[PDB]
Amino acid sequence: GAQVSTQKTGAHEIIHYTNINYYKDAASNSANRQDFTQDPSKFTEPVKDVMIKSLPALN
Amino acid sequence: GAQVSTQKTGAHEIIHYTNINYYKDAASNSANRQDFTQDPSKFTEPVKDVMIKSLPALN
Amino acid sequence: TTDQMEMFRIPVTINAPLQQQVFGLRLQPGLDSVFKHTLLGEILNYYAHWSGSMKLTFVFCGSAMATGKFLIAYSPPGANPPKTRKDAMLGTHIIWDIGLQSSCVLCVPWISQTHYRLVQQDEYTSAGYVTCWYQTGMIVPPGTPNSSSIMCFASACNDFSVRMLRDTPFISQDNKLQ
Amino acid sequence: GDVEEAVVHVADTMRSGPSNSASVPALTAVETGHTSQVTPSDTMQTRHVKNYHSRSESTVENFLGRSACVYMEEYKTTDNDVNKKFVAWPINTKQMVQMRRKLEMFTYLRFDMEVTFVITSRQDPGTTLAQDMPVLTHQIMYVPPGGPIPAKVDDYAWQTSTNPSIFWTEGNAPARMSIPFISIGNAYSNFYDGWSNFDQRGSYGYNTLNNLGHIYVRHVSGSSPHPITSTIRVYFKPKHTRAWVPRPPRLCQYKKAFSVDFTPTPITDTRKDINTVT
Amino acid sequence: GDVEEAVVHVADTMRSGPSNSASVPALTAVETGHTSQVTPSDTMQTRHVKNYHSRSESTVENFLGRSACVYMEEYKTTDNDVNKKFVAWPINTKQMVQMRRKLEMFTYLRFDMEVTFVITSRQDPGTTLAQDMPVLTHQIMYVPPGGPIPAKVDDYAWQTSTNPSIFWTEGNAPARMSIPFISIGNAYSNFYDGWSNFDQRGSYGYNTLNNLGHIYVRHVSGSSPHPITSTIRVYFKPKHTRAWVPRPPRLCQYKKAFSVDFTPTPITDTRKDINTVT
Amino acid sequence: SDRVRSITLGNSTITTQECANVVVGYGRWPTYLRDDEATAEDQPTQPDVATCRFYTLDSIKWEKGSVGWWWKFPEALSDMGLFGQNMQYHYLGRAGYTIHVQCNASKFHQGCLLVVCVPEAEMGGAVVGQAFSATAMANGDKAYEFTSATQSDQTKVQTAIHNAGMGVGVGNLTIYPHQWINLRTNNSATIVMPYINSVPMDNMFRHYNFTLMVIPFVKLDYADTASTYVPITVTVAPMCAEYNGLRLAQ
Amino acid sequence: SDRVRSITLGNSTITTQECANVVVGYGRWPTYLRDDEATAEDQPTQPDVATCRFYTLDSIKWEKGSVGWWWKFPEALSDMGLFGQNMQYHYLGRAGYTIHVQCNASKFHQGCLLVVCVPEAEMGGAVVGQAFSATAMANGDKAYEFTSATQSDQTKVQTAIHNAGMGVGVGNLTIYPHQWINLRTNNSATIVMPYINSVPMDNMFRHYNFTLMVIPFVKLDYADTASTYVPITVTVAPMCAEYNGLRLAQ
Ligand SMILES: CN1CCN(Cc2ccc(NCc3ccc(C(F)(F)F)cc3)cc2)CC1
């Protein structure tokens, strides 16, 4: 019941670490700071009709 | 001789932990607070003849 | 109440002014004095949060020849409790008819904005009121007592639950027992 | 395979519509001793609700699975009175009200025990306090019933050869230890409605079944030029619990450590009238 | 298998050459509420650039995943005033400005909590300081809402049977502990534009939703011949965080711990004129 | 046993342990308007559990000298709950009703009541050739009393009980849907009335769909008891209500 | 052409020949509550076309010296049509909104307005450490005016425009859903706001879901014309409204 996952490193320069959970409550686990998904559309493009950057904004 | 079992978490939001026993006496083990079976019939329906909720209680 | 046992009986009379109130109470199972020391309130007082529906069962303990009808209504939280039967009947209610079956139940549904409510209830987590009114009145034949009594039973449904174990405030000591 | 791989939400609410039939779930009869099993779906229209609440925290294991203090006492490192330099406590769970009430909600219990000891020391006030003392050490002795009992701090009985003991030094973590189910019967009894003698005479009540032994504590060899006072607190934490025959919680305040004696108390508080709701 | 084997760089720049066409990416209309998605490649010639920068450190988990102090208070081991020998703090995150502002950038939050306690002691000045005291011990008590509250250092309420508590001895590592998501609602609310009573009266603002309980601290049994003062610091560290509805950061200085009251402030600093660049 | 009945509408429930069967109008259960019979074009509103629920009107006293009472609908419910508001804010309306009448007495009382719903119960004035206002026959939830003697005041309806204010024999009202409340064996009457009219929908403030009448055919009687009167209560619940034509209220 | 928009809710329609695109909250369209997120048990009411329709609030004047206005919802609609009645008669409520703001002027006028919906727009009092009643920030449909200078009266909210009564930079309100009304190319703004809260449902009389603000960033200006002011009108339409917990009104 041991998880093996990669660790943060450079771009092009054994980059593995092991984790085990000792407690029966999920709140005791360590921070899951390895997620890097993001989507700015909800705040940058809240319009109904899709607008193309190349075409004029209006007409 | 390691047990792997799930840990308490949310409803719809690696949820595993490992346990090993180090002592030869079962009294030294940790609390087994992961059991959630229950049956209120012994105290709520102690009658001999089964009664249906829909039908009248008497006659 | 000079006699403690009198606390368990709700008085009733024969010639009641039409549409009179029988009783009224706040729905605070863990804080109101009515439910404080009941078998349910005692359990809730060991916790901080609670949720689910409740059952109120009323039993008529009058004569066998007596008859009557009663209206029992539950009013969700609001700015004012009901003052008359017309106000009360707008909320959830049931018409109780006294006959061979001597008891009727009134399931108080779980209507709340939050998944849980505080045992130490406040204005934010208020729960409402429960009241009972005369529907038709009590009628008795000659040679019977002019008064009767009713009793109420409280229990939790199968969807009830509690949370956050805490220490009860009903018991305390000043010195070590010997 | 060097591994062995080893949740019950409350009931949901079903949609209900208008009804008009001879079935009457609302009416019942409490005279049978039967609690009604009606649900809100049986007396009003309801929507379909998926409920994820669970009763995990309401289990007896979790309810009783909390450490609670059961006894404290003070003893001095040096003093004229011999009896004041050590403690001797007959084991019992009736001393402290909170844990007593928590346990007394059931008639019979069967569990393992986890015991933790918290010890603190302080220097007594006086006209001359300047002194230097190394770290103190403490000994905890458990004497099953019938064993020898020490009569003074430096008695021979403190040389335990069979009696379990713990030696602890100040500044470290509190001492901890486990005890199995050590009752002669099949389960502990919080209440005992009976007598000791066969002719209905002698001791009465749960005092008759309390034969768990004693606990003794002392300073190993510390003897300061000036008095020093230490306090010990005992904490019990049931494990692997099982309970039978629940009983109503107590209402009157406790008054004796080995009796049920009480004073009559009102059922509950009062209000202006039966209609007052404000 | 006793193992289970479980990165997104910023956008690159594409080569662009001279252009002459009817397409006009530069011109847009902000009246739509739409932020332009143009890139430097769309308005000038650019070379091909492979970019390895990542936004790992800008995630909300890392931004809020730092322990920050939220409260400190002092209590004495011995004194004439009973209220001065222990602390009683209603839990809230509005006391300290840095963490308050960090949290107030979002409307709703949902996270687990990690609490760490730092305790230090010092001897009060006086005309006579010579004394010898063993190591001190401290107790931290958490009382959910509605529970009994101690009225003095040696009150019976300190015998926790259900209330979690921590006993800590000076000289060891700071105490640490975890708390799950304990809100009655689906998420914490930093702001609440509403009232307490249904007729729009009573308390107003986020003070209405603060019912997290209290924390109490005391010296277990330490009572020195001379006063000793101790200080406790509380640190919060959110874990497994989720946020919704971001809002602009605050500009005016805080003035109340349970209100949004403020004093008007200039938008920003000034300069000599619109053309000054030196 | 078939002598126990339970009715559940909306967030209200009615339970009777002592009742007869249930009469269903002319054999037709209330239902929504069909697509091939409608005339209005705009979508109708269907307040469901908010308007379809039991509403208890005020209670009356039954004395030895009572003659009878009547109520006119939906003017009786015109100012009740959300039903009244929805009536006020709409031009057209349509709904069936369920009527429940409660009356209980000991086994030593005697009496018989007739409960009947009369559709289009047009009434004539006391002084023939003299008009009456819309206050001598409907003023909200209050009940109007019949009279044993011939009415003489010109400002109110002819209340002769034996004619029922309609110029017809009172004993012939059995043709309409009805039930009897006999204290020997009954305590309540239940009638389900579908929507009856010559048009798919109509304004509820201008037109009285039907009238409810309670007449004691056998006068109440008792001897040597402390109870001086027998209260009567009426409960009504609209069914399958739908409204159309939103305008300014009133 | 994409510069013409038409919106049809209930028995009302809105047509604009001169408008920009439509902003949809945070990309979420209003919808009914799901079965696996609800907490209340009793069936919810869904007044459909009776509550979901456009309701035009009172109009304001835009002068050369105007500073801005704000409205708080749903207190603004608390006494409008059947929506207000249904709010009064129920304990819990839930609904999304569609906000339309109208402002038209000739080609020779100049000015820019910011239209933004601020959820949970908690406001502070003028005199710090002094409470205000529920009348200095919401009194029905009337609009409340911002102030250029710092507020001094202790009985009302701090109306400093540059702080927006929330202690934040007025220029940073762009983060919330918003649109601009520029007289050069625009006459109306449309915003669709879904239901945003920390609980599935809430009482609408105790809690202000969101606040609507209109701020002139560029003051109105004109020369040599007979028109002295430019009226502004606001129209709102609840969407997918459903209520629960019938109690006595008020
Ligand atoms: C009245 N209650 C009946 C049940 N009984 C349970 C119980 C049984 C045994 C113990 N032992 C505690 C203990 C004492 C001494 C040591 C020693 F230090 F000697 F090893 C260890 C554990 C506790 C409770 C409780 C009373």
Ligand SMILES: CN1CCN(Cc2ccc(NCc3ccc(C(F)(F)F)cc3)cc2)CC1
């Ligand atoms: C205004 N902010 C709302 C969100 N809330 C989050 C939050 C919730 C609970 C805690 N608990 C801290 C804690 C107190 C006491 C103990 C004890 F020592 F009693 F076990 C443990 C943890 C903190 C923050 C913060 C306020």
Ligand SMILES: CCCCCCCCCCCCCC(=O)O
């Ligand atoms: C309470 C858990 C203690 C774990 C102690 C360290 C791990 C010992 C077992 C070796 C790792 C194998 C774990 C696994 O089977 O997943």
Ligand SMILES: CCCCCCCCCCCCCC(=O)O
């Ligand atoms: C006294 C037991 C000490 C155990 C030390 C940690 C475990 C080391 C072995 C790795 C885990 C495998 C255990 C197993 O075979 O079940």
